[PDB]
Structure formats: C-alpha cells, structure tokens
CSV table of all heavy atoms in Angstrom, one decimal:
chain,number,residue,atom,x,y,z
A,26,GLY,N,4.9,6.0,5.0
A,26,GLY,CA,4.0,5.4,4.1
A,26,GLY,C,2.8,4.8,4.9
A,26,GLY,O,2.7,5.1,6.1
A,27,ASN,N,2.0,4.0,4.2
A,27,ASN,CA,0.9,3.3,4.9
A,27,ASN,C,1.1,1.8,4.9
A,27,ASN,O,1.7,1.2,4.0
A,27,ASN,CB,-0.4,3.6,4.1
A,27,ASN,CG,-0.9,5.0,4.4
A,27,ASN,OD1,-0.4,6.0,3.9
A,27,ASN,ND2,-1.9,5.1,5.2
A,28,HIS,N,0.6,1.2,6.0
A,28,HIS,CA,0.7,-0.3,6.2
A,28,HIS,C,0.2,-1.0,4.9
A,28,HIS,O,1.0,-1.7,4.2
A,28,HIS,CB,0.0,-0.7,7.4
A,28,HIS,CG,0.1,-2.2,7.7
A,28,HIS,ND1,-0.8,-2.9,8.4
A,28,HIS,CD2,1.1,-3.1,7.3
A,28,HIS,CE1,-0.5,-4.1,8.5
A,28,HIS,NE2,0.7,-4.3,7.8
A,29,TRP,N,-1.1,-0.9,4.7
A,29,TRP,CA,-1.7,-1.6,3.6
A,29,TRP,C,-1.5,-0.8,2.3
A,29,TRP,O,-0.7,0.1,2.2
A,29,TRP,CB,-3.2,-1.7,3.8
A,29,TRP,CG,-4.0,-0.5,3.6
A,29,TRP,CD1,-3.7,0.8,3.9
A,29,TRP,CD2,-5.3,-0.4,2.9
A,29,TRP,NE1,-4.7,1.6,3.5
A,29,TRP,CE2,-5.6,0.9,2.9
A,29,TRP,CE3,-6.1,-1.3,2.3
A,29,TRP,CZ2,-6.8,1.4,2.3
A,29,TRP,CZ3,-7.3,-0.9,1.7
A,29,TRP,CH2,-7.6,0.5,1.7
A,30,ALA,N,-2.2,-1.2,1.2
A,30,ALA,CA,-2.1,-0.5,-0.1
A,30,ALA,C,-0.7,-0.7,-0.7
A,30,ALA,O,-0.2,0.2,-1.4
A,30,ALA,CB,-2.4,1.0,0.1
A,31,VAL,N,-0.1,-1.8,-0.4
A,31,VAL,CA,1.2,-2.2,-0.9
A,31,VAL,C,1.1,-3.0,-2.2
A,31,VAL,O,2.1,-3.7,-2.5
A,31,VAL,CB,2.0,-2.9,0.2
A,31,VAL,CG1,2.2,-2.1,1.4
A,31,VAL,CG2,1.4,-4.3,0.4
A,32,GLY,N,0.0,-2.9,-2.9
A,32,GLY,CA,-0.2,-3.6,-4.1
A,32,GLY,C,-0.7,-2.7,-5.2
A,32,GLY,O,-1.6,-3.2,-6.0
A,33,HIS,N,-0.3,-1.5,-5.3
A,33,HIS,CA,-0.7,-0.5,-6.3
A,33,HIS,C,0.5,0.2,-6.9
A,33,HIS,O,0.7,0.3,-8.1
A,33,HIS,CB,-1.8,0.4,-5.7
A,33,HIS,CG,-2.8,-0.3,-4.9
A,33,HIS,ND1,-3.6,-1.3,-5.4
A,33,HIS,CD2,-3.2,-0.1,-3.6
A,33,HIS,CE1,-4.4,-1.7,-4.4
A,33,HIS,NE2,-4.2,-1.0,-3.3
A,34,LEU,N,1.2,0.9,-6.0
A,34,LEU,CA,2.4,1.7,-6.4
A,34,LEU,C,3.5,0.8,-6.9
A,34,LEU,O,4.1,1.1,-8.0
A,34,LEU,CB,2.9,2.5,-5.2
A,34,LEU,CG,3.2,4.0,-5.4
A,34,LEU,CD1,2.0,4.8,-5.1
A,34,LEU,CD2,4.4,4.4,-4.6
A,35,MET,N,3.8,-0.3,-6.2
A,35,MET,CA,4.8,-1.2,-6.7
A,35,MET,C,4.2,-2.7,-6.7
A,35,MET,O,3.3,-3.0,-6.0
A,35,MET,CB,6.0,-1.2,-5.7
A,35,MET,CG,5.6,-1.5,-4.2
A,35,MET,SD,5.2,-0.1,-3.3
A,35,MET,CE,3.5,-0.4,-2.8
C-alpha cells in the first residue's frame, strides 16, 4: 500500500 492516503479507503 501507500504511506499516506490512509483517510479515504478506511
């Protein structure tokens, strides 16, 4: 996965 962008999928 990616470090950031952890506030969209979940």
Side-chain angles (χ1 to χ4, degrees):
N27 282 78
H28 181 205
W29 79 317
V31 301
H33 315 304
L34 227 92
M35 58 268 122

